[PDB]
Design an enzyme around this catalytic site. Structure first.
Site, PDB file in Angstrom:
ATOM      1  N   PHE A  78       4.770  -5.935  14.432  1.00 51.79           N
ATOM      2  CA  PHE A  78       5.878  -6.593  15.090  1.00 51.79           C
ATOM      3  C   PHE A  78       6.037  -6.134  16.530  1.00 51.79           C
ATOM      4  O   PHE A  78       5.869  -4.942  16.791  1.00 51.79           O
ATOM      5  CB  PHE A  78       7.101  -6.278  14.237  1.00 51.79           C
ATOM      6  N   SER A 153       1.832  -1.885   9.779  1.00 51.15           N
ATOM      7  CA  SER A 153       3.064  -2.603   9.504  1.00 51.15           C
ATOM      8  C   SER A 153       2.987  -4.090   9.229  1.00 51.15           C
ATOM      9  O   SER A 153       2.430  -4.475   8.193  1.00 51.15           O
ATOM     10  CB  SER A 153       3.937  -2.285  10.663  1.00 51.15           C
ATOM     11  N   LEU A 154       3.523  -5.024  10.015  1.00 51.53           N
ATOM     12  CA  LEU A 154       3.263  -6.424   9.726  1.00 51.53           C
ATOM     13  C   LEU A 154       1.728  -6.695   9.823  1.00 51.53           C
ATOM     14  O   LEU A 154       1.157  -7.411   9.010  1.00 51.53           O
ATOM     15  CB  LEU A 154       4.124  -7.161  10.721  1.00 51.53           C
ATOM     16  N   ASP A 177       1.488   2.060   7.063  1.00 46.64           N
ATOM     17  CA  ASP A 177       2.856   1.744   6.825  1.00 46.64           C
ATOM     18  C   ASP A 177       3.127   0.259   6.848  1.00 46.64           C
ATOM     19  O   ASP A 177       3.596  -0.323   7.806  1.00 46.64           O
ATOM     20  CB  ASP A 177       3.711   2.486   7.815  1.00 46.64           C
ATOM     21  N   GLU A 188       1.434 -10.202  -5.070  1.00 44.15           N
ATOM     22  CA  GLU A 188       0.190  -9.890  -4.393  1.00 44.15           C
ATOM     23  C   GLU A 188      -0.419 -10.837  -3.333  1.00 44.15           C
ATOM     24  O   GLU A 188      -1.356 -10.487  -2.499  1.00 44.15           O
ATOM     25  CB  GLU A 188      -0.806  -9.657  -5.501  1.00 44.15           C
ATOM     26  N   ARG A 191       1.652 -10.332  -0.262  1.00 41.21           N
ATOM     27  CA  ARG A 191       1.249  -9.034   0.303  1.00 41.21           C
ATOM     28  C   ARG A 191      -0.149  -8.391   0.030  1.00 41.21           C
ATOM     29  O   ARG A 191      -1.154  -8.915  -0.616  1.00 41.21           O
ATOM     30  CB  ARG A 191       2.344  -8.022  -0.068  1.00 41.21           C
ATOM     31  N   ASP A 193      -2.201  -5.600  -1.467  1.00 42.03           N
ATOM     32  CA  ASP A 193      -2.195  -5.076  -2.805  1.00 42.03           C
ATOM     33  C   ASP A 193      -3.666  -4.851  -3.070  1.00 42.03           C
ATOM     34  O   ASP A 193      -4.468  -5.615  -2.520  1.00 42.03           O
ATOM     35  CB  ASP A 193      -1.623  -6.118  -3.723  1.00 42.03           C
ATOM     36  N   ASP A 196      -6.802  -7.296  -2.420  1.00 40.54           N
ATOM     37  CA  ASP A 196      -7.236  -8.072  -1.276  1.00 40.54           C
ATOM     38  C   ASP A 196      -8.543  -7.481  -0.709  1.00 40.54           C
ATOM     39  O   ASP A 196      -9.188  -8.090   0.135  1.00 40.54           O
ATOM     40  CB  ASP A 196      -6.049  -8.111  -0.278  1.00 40.54           C
ATOM     41  N   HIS A 264       7.406   5.376  11.626  1.00 36.39           N
ATOM     42  CA  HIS A 264       6.719   4.141  11.331  1.00 36.39           C
ATOM     43  C   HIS A 264       5.477   4.060  12.174  1.00 36.39           C
ATOM     44  O   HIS A 264       4.550   3.331  11.821  1.00 36.39           O
ATOM     45  CB  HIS A 264       7.640   2.964  11.653  1.00 36.39           C
TER      46      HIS A 264
END
Ligand SMILES: CCCCCCCCCCCC(=O)OC[C@H](COP(=O)(O)OCC[N+](C)(C)C)OC(=O)CCCCCCCCCCC
Ligand SMILES: CCCCCCCCCO[C@@H]1O[C@H](CO)[C@@H](O)[C@H](O)[C@H]1O
Ligand SMILES: [Ca+2]
Lengths: 449, 85
Positions: A78, A153-154, A177, A188, A191, A193, A196, A264
């Site tokens: 982000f 993150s994202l 993170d 899944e 996200r 998991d 992937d 983060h």
């Protein structure tokens, strides 16, 4: 409500992409024209200037990408851009240890906007990274096993799309993170998991709740290996008062970033550091963190401790189960690597009340004194403690002992250590002995036995 | 930490602020922030009047061995190495 694009396909706000407890809003990915993903290639050949590339043979052909070496894509989260220095500096560190095609994925047209829209734009970014990996395989016969997608993150969930769409065939994803809002708790699909990619390892460094605690990362386990340094919730160095946090050892910018998101962002600083400290982030399997600090998960198993970071893929048990938790501790400021030791002191002299501290001496270096015990120091009792040295001291040659108490006792008592035993994270035990007791604040050297 | 009981890395105007009693900075016009007391075999300064160090003093049981006597070094450059005695 589907939205289809050329090369990337259709995107629909149907569940679980929208309309679940975790994701109420029905929003579609933007773009592709707007998110505007770009692959900024840096290689050992061109360590300082990326050259922008794309999924077409004349771009791959005209650049320093070699199909004979691995490809590590770094995806940001982000608000960042792929030109931010931490993406370039993971590369700058990778080149010290390998020949690698380092592709920084910039999606700032889709990342500098409301969070709820940046969470959806992820999808175009994962779609966009998949297509380039599909195309290296079609055009240049380059197998997805050679690909590594590092995403912060994202960007960790973007990586999770990339693998989903190449279903599982990419080498590994490293989610640093993974963002919690709109992902923790969801399926899944939506996200990162373990499915992937062939291996997924995670570094958790902000596992607190987004509300109330503004913990940006997620606490849930999304990988084969999930590492929780300093227990994953609150990172050392991050509780510095705002003026020495912003005014950093170089960077109002790196300072501001840590004021905003220290914990983060600590996940890519640990990963960046691991590249060049290959034994320096050992992972202790434990029931929890509280047990690990209760000095009940050391040493490593005959099996090994996985390294958190760049060498976790060298762990033999890595894909043996999903969600395996490893605990460990790092530094507060850079060069986060630490080497945990265990020391058991067996006391001698008079029963006094003090602190006992130890220092290790080995062929590679020596150390700070660490405190093993503070309390009633009764002769003949033993007292152990584990500690994260900042120096891997080599094979132990000596150990020195020292105690001090808060109140001056004129009897002038002397305490010593008859036997100290240092055990390493592999379990090598070194014993040391001394028959002498010493005064307050005097340093008792103990020699080999 | 806030203005006393400062953690290492917190910006520092005087060493007693710091939990390690060592405010330090590389050079003269450098921001002073809390740091380490020195360990055996690292450089160190002997305790000073001046308030912030360029080299912290040693851990306990240890002696910053160098030439103290000198007024001038007894100003800002009284450096040494931490020896056990
Ligand atoms: C309160 C609900 C917010 C919901 C979003 C929470 C984040 C969840 C997902 C993790 C985010 C992520 O993907 O990692 C992205 C990270 C963190 O951004 P952040 O975590 O949002 O920080 C929240 C604060 N911002 C929105 C301001 C970022 O990049 C960063 O360095 C953020 C650094 C911005 C620094 C501020 C600089 C101001 C200008 C320069 C002055 C010279
Ligand atoms: C929420 C934070 C603000 C978003 C947009 C950036 C604000 C201006 C920050 O600059 O600057 C650094 C060196 O000067 C660059 O290396 C870095 O890339 C920039 O960026
Ligand atoms: Ca997934």
């Amino acid at each position: 409500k589907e939205v289809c694009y050329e090369r990337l396909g259709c995107f629909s706000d149907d569940s679980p992409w929208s309309g679940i407890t975790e994701r109420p809003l029905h929003i579609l990915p933007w773009s592709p024209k707007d998110v505007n993903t770009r692959f900024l290639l840096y290689t050992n050949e061109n360590p300082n200037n990326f050259q922008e590339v794309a999924a077409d043979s004349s771009s791959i052909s005209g650049s320093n990408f070699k199909t004979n070496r691995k490809t590590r894509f770094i995806i940001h989260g982000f608000i960042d851009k792929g030109e931010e220095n931490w993406l370039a500096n993971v590369c700058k560190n990778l080149f010290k240890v390998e020949s690698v095609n380092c592709i920084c994925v910039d999606w700032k047209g889709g990342s500098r906007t409301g969070y709820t829209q940046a969470s959806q734009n992820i999808r175009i970014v994962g779609a966009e990274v998949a297509y380039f990996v599909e195309f290296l395989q079609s055009a240049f016969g380059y197998s997805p096993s050679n690909v590594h997608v590092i995403g912060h993150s994202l960007g960790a969930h973007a990586a999770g799309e990339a693998g989903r769409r190449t279903n599982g065939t990419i080498g590994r994803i490293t989610g640093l993170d993974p963002a919690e809002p709109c992902f923790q708790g969801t399926p899944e699909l939506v996200r990162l998991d373990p499915s992937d990619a062939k291996f997924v390892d995670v570094i958790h460094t902000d596992g607190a709740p987004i509300v109330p605690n503004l913990g940006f990362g997620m606490s849930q386990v999304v990988g084969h290996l999930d590492f929780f340094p300093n227990g994953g919730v609150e990172m050392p160095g991050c509780k510095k008062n705002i003026l020495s946090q912003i005014v950093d050892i170089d960077g109002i910018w790196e300072g501001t970033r840590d004021f905003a998101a220290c914990n983060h962002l600590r996940s890519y600083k640990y990963y960046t550091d691991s590249i060049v400290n290959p034994d320096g982030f050992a992972g202790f399997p434990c029931a929890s963190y509280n047990v690990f600090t209760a000095n009940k998960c050391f040493p490593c198993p005959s099996g090994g401790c996985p390294q958190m970071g760049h060498y976790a893929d060298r762990y033999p048990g890595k894909t043996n189960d999903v969600g395996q938790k490893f605990y460990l501790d790092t530094g507060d400021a850079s060069n986060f690597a630490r080497w945990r030791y265990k020391v058991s002191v067996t006391l001698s002299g008079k029963k006094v009340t003090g602190h006992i501290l130890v220092s290790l001496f080995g062929n590679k270096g020596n150390s700070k004194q660490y405190e093993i015990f503070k309390g009633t120091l009764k002769p003949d009792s033993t007292h152990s403690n584990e500690f994260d040295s900042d120096v891997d001291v080599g094979d132990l040659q000596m150990v020195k002992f020292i105690w001090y108490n808060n109140v001056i006792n004129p009897t002038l008592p002397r305490v010593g250590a008859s036997k100290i035993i240092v055990e390493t994270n592999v379990g090598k035990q070194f014993n040391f002995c001394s028959p002498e007791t010493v005064r307050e604040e005097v340093l008792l050297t103990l020699t080999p036995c | 930490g806030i203005i006393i009981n400062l953690d290492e890395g917190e910006l520092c105007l005087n060493s007693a602020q710091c939990k390690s009693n060592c405010c330090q900075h590389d050079t003269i016009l450098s921001l002073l922030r809390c740091a380490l007391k020195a360990r055996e075999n690292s450089e160190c300064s002997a305790f000073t009047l001046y308030g912030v160090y360029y080299k912290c003093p040693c851990e306990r049981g240890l002696t910053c061995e160098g030439d103290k006597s000198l007024v001038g070094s007894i100003t800002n450059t009284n450096f040494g190495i931490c020896h056990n005695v």
